[PDB]
Ligand binder design. Structure first.
Ligand SMILES: Cc1c(O)cccc1C(=O)N[C@@H](CSc1ccccc1)[C@H](O)CN1C[C@H]2CCCC[C@H]2C[C@H]1C(=O)NC(C)(C)C
Lengths: 99, 99
C-alpha cells in the first residue's frame, strides 16, 4: 500500500497472539510496545524520547504481523502511550518514504 | 525521491536563513526544532514524547525549505535533541509511506 500522512499512520499488528494498533514511525530507531506479556528471555534497556527516558524490556526474535507481512525482530516493551513500529521493523516490510 | 529506512531519514532544511539537518518523522504530529532564533510572534506550548514533556515556542506561517520543496507551516522550537519534521510539513511535500 501507499499511506499518506494527513492522519497518523496507524496499522493493525498481531504479536504474541494479540491484536493491537501501532504507529508506523520513521523517526523511531526501535519498536516500542505498551505493557504486554511476551514469553521468553528479556534484557533491561533505557530509551530516550523527546522529554526524557523510559525503562523497557528488550525481547529479541519476536514474530510480528504488520499489515499481513510477517516479520521477526527486536521489540521493546514499556510505558509508551502509543505502540510504535520503528525502523528496525519498517525495513523488514520494505517500507519507504516517497515524495 | 524514494528514501529507504536502513538509516535515519535525515534531510537538509533551510529555515530562518540557516541550514540544518532534520529527521523525516511520520510518528510526529508536529515539527520541532532545536533552539534557534526565529523572528516574529510565538505562543507557549507543551509537547509530549516518549519519556515526558518539553516546553516549546510555537511559530506560525514559517517558511522552510525541505529537499528543495518550499513549505509554510507551524514550527515548534525547544529542547529537542534532534530536529524533527512532522506530519504537518510532510503532507506539504506530498510525502507518503509505501511498501
Ligand atoms: C521511540 C524512539 C526510539 O526507539 C529511538 C529514538 C527516538 C525515538 C522517539 O521517541 N522518536 C520520536 C521523535 S523524537 C526523537 C528523539 C531522539 C531521536 C530521534 C527522535 C517519535 O518518532 C515521535 N513520537 C512518537 C510517539 C512516541 C510515544 C509517545 C507519543 C509519540 C510522541 C512522538 C513525538 O516525539 N512527537 C514530537 C512532536 C514531540 C516530536
Amino acid at each position: 500500500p501507499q499511506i499518506t500522512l494527513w492522519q497518523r499512520p496507524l496499522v493493525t499488528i498481531k504479536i504474541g497472539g494479540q491484536l493491537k494498533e501501532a504507529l508506523l514511525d520513521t523517526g523511531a530507531d526501535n519498536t516500542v510496545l505498551e505493557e504486554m506479556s511476551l514469553p521468553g528471555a528479556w534484557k533491561p534497556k533505557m530509551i530516550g524520547g523527546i522529554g526524557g527516558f523510559i525503562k523497557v524490556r528488550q525481547y529479541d526474535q519476536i514474530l510480528i504481523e504488520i499489515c499481513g507481512h510477517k516479520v521477526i525482530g527486536t521489540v521493546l516493551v514499556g510505558p509508551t502511550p502509543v505502540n510504535i513500529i520503528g525502523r528496525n521493523l519498517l525495513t523488514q516490510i520494505g517500507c519507504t518514504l516517497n515524495f
